[PDB]
Design a protein around this ligand. Structure first.
Ligand SMILES: Cc1cc2nc3c(=O)[nH]c(=O)nc-3n(C[C@H](O)[C@H](O)[C@H](O)COP(=O)(O)OP(=O)(O)OC[C@H]3O[C@@H](n4cnc5c(N)ncnc54)[C@H](O)[C@@H]3O)c2cc1C
Length: 422
């Protein structure tokens, strides 16, 4: 019975494990470095396509999402100019200050918190699956015997198949390519995000009631803001994205403390309505650096009996929806290919190589485009600046690549490519 080891029990490793279990594939173990589930505060938007894939992995995943997720009641999102308005009245005037309007019905976002979603999937696993305190630090893959896994606690395990879902700073990715391969380390994208909860009446004062009661965006030079009423409208959530003209001075460390005054200087020259909104921010807050794999995409996702999936393979900026969206497609391809293997060593190798061959172009395209979408919202992308007609045309062309996609076609293409090679 195929021994399958999944490295890291994040969103994609859970989905990958649940997909293989749903199909009764081999024996599945998840090795998770942390002693218990890491507490990660993060907000996600899953596309309709991602949810199709969830449903094919294990319907209970989609049932779990649908009970914790919220959808925007309005399909249309207006992108407002936060920079040029000189008065609150100009800033609220849709005829003067709306750069463009996006119709999101095709993406069909569902928003949820990573923690609650992750927990709803965790309880779907049998207790025997997850092994905490198992930080993978190296492995040996070769010869006519299982992969040998080595953990930081001195223990050693073996597996026929390794799927590394160990995140943006994947250890398995560096073992696989070499710690000095250009693609071994994800890099700062130069976008950082600050988040804040602020009282609805203060938001109303700053933005006017019509803007504050719906999901909106504000664009401007080197920054953009996403903000929306929360739950029953007693509170207003603000997501402030900023470009960094400095390189990251911390390590792989992604959340660092910052003072409210980095925010204020970012929107120093913006309309009065954004300055006032930025003021409502706490004075200590956590800055989150967005790392991705745009500068040096991986040459491949698999070698021998080891495959990378999720952020370990294609960490992405969030401007086309969660980076996890592409990881869900990885998990589905992997489940469908390993089912073929079960129904040897060279079979395993071919499956993971097929996985890589079929997933790499679309997922690396997504890393590149979501990077560029962040620049567009911040008037840094090529010539376009703040031309709203050009930004809107870019949003529609890029999003169509994502949502206008044949999921069943992907499954059948991977299964057939495998069948021919075997
Ligand atoms: C503070 C923060 C904010 C974020 N905000 C957003 C956001 O707004 N939008 C968005 O789309 N994404 C965001 N993310 C990223 C998002 O959580 C991930 O993209 C998502 O969970 C999919 O990643 P993944 O499953 O492939 O990897 P991860 O969720 O990162 O999971 C990897 C797992 O592997 C484990 N692991 C790591 N190294 C080892 C090792 N050597 N051995 C064993 N286990 C190991 C980790 O403990 C972890 O549980 C945020 C992340 C953080 C930390």
């Amino acid at each position: 019975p195929l021994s399958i080891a999944i490295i890291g029990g994040g969103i994609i490793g859970l989905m990958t494990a649940l997909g293989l279990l749903h199909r009764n594939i081999g024996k599945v173990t998840i090795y998770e470095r942390a002693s218990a589930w890491p507490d990660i505060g993060a907000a996600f938007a899953f596309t309709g396509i991602a949810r199709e894939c969830m449903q094919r992995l294990d319907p209970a995943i989609l049932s779990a999402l649908s009970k914790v997720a919220q959808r925007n009641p309005h399909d249309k999102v207006r992108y407002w100019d936060g920079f040029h308005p000189k008065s609150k009245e100009e800033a609220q005037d849709p005829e003067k200050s709306v750069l463009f309007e996006i119709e999101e019905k095709n993406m069909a976002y569902w928003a949820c918190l990573r923690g609650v979603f992750h927990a709803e999937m965790a309880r779907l696993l049998p207790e025997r699956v997850v092994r905490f305190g198992k930080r993978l630090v190296a492995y040996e893959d070769g010869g006519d015997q299982k992969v040998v896994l080595r953990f930081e606690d001195g223990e050693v395990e073996e597996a026929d198949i390794v799927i590394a879902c160990d995140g943006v700073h994947s250890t398995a990715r560096r073992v696989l390519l070499g710690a000095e391969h250009p693609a071994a380390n994800a890099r700062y994208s130069r976008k950082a995000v600050y988040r804040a909860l602020v009282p609805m009446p203060a938001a109303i004062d700053a933005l006017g009631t019509e803007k504050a009661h719906v999901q909106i965006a504000h664009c401007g030079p080197d920054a953009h803001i996403v903000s929306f009423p929360v739950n029953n409208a007693q509170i207003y959530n603000v997501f402030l994205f900023t470009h960094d003209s400095n390189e990251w001075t911390h390590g792989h460390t992604m959340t660092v403390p910052s003072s409210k005054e980095e925010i204020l200087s970012a929107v120093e020259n913006w309309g009065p309505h954004i300055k006032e909104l930025a003021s409502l921010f706490p004075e200590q807050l956590s800055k989150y650096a967005i790392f991705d794999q745009a500068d040096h995409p991986l040459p491949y996702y698999a070698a021998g009996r080891v495959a990378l999936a999720g952020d370990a393979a294609h960490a992405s900026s969030p401007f086309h929806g969660a980076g996890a969206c592409m990881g869900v497609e990885d998990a589905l391809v992997l489940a469908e290919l390993l089912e073929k293997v079960q129904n040897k060593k060279s079979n395993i190798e071919l499956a993971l190589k097929t996985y890589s061959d079929v997933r790499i172009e679309r997922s690396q395209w997504l890393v590149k485009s979501s990077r560029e979408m962040g620049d567009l919202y911040e008037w840094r992308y090529e010539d376009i600046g703040g031309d709203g007609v050009k930004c809107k045309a870019e949003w529609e062309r890029r999003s169509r690549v994502i949502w206008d996609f044949d999921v069943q076609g992907m499954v059948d293409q991977a299964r057939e490519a495998y069948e021919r090679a075997v």
